[PDB]
Design a protein around this ligand. Structure first.
Ligand SMILES: CCC[C@@H](C)CCCOC(=O)[C@@H]1CCCC[C@@H]1C(=O)O
Length: 254
């Protein structure tokens, strides 16, 4: 029923805003000159980095903790998705283990543009080339993400659409090590059903956006494998970087 699907979207949207502080609507407003409250601090060179503190190893160490904040926020949101808590806890953990990262990149794009990414809850904006100027294996970490985001943001998705897109990625059913696949797939299908309804009602001009997301869902899987394997280099060659245990266990068994 369309009505039940529309209710689920509003519910997930409400959980989405609660669980996640910075919304794409908010992020765009700051990334554009639409907001009058404040103009974002721009980190274009190391100097501006030092001015804002008042290096690549530190940047990622900072990215790590926010990743941990995100894991909590995603975990807080996953519980909101009806049917998640009633699943086998083993599968609940497994679903979050492999989905968390793919979700981070999806929402990171909301805070990204071709020029750079918003940082510090929208108070700052770090340039893409500055991140590229980490020619050490760190400078490669962010170029692929920017390219995906520009293409992903071309779909012109909004928070209402993203809320359901995230939920689908969580309730995958194809992730390794799931014990009861059927009940997970049952939830995803209804979530996919609601996504199609949302996209058609929210994106009239755009056609087959449902397919575009499904294709992008596959791309996110590769981007994660690139992050994991790229991390594999750091663990061996660059022992100067350390990994937070929770993330390190998530990275375990790919
Ligand atoms: C919902 C958005 C969350 C943003 C703020 C997270 C910013 C980037 O976080 C990362 O990717 C780092 C990158 C390097 C170390 C691993 C770590 C990770 O892969 O989790």
């Amino acid at each position: 029923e369309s009505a039940d699907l529309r209710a689920l979207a509003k519910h997930l949207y409400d959980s989405y805003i609660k669980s996640f502080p910075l919304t794409k609507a908010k992020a765009r407003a700051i990334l554009t000159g639409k907001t009058t409250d404040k103009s974002p601090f721009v980190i274009y060179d190391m100097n501006s980095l030092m001015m804002g503190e008042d290096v690549a190893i530190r940047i990622f160490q900072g990215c790590q903790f926010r990743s941990v904040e995100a894991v909590q926020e995603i975990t807080e949101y996953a519980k909101s998705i009806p049917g998640f808590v009633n699943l086998d806890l083993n599968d609940q953990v497994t679903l979050l283990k492999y989905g968390v990262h793919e979700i981070i990149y999806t929402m990171l794009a909301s805070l990204m543009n071709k020029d750079g990414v918003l940082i510090s809850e929208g108070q700052g904006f770090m340039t893409r080339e500055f991140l590229k100027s980490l020619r050490k294996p760190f400078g490669d970490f962010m170029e692929p993400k920017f390219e995906f985001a520009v293409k992903f943001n071309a779909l012109e998705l909004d928070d209402s659409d993203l809320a359901i897109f995230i939920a689908v990625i969580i309730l995958s059913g194809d992730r390794p090590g799931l014990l009861n696949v059927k009940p997970i797939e049952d939830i995803q299908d209804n979530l996919l059903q609601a996504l199609e309804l949302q996209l058609k009602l929210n994106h009239p001009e755009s056609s087959q956006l449902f397919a575009k997301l499904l294709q992008k869902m596959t791309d996110l899987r590769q981007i994660v494998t690139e992050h994991v394997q790229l991390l594999q280099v750091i663990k061996k060659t660059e022992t100067d970087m350390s990994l937070h245990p929770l993330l390190q266990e998530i990275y375990k068994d790919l």
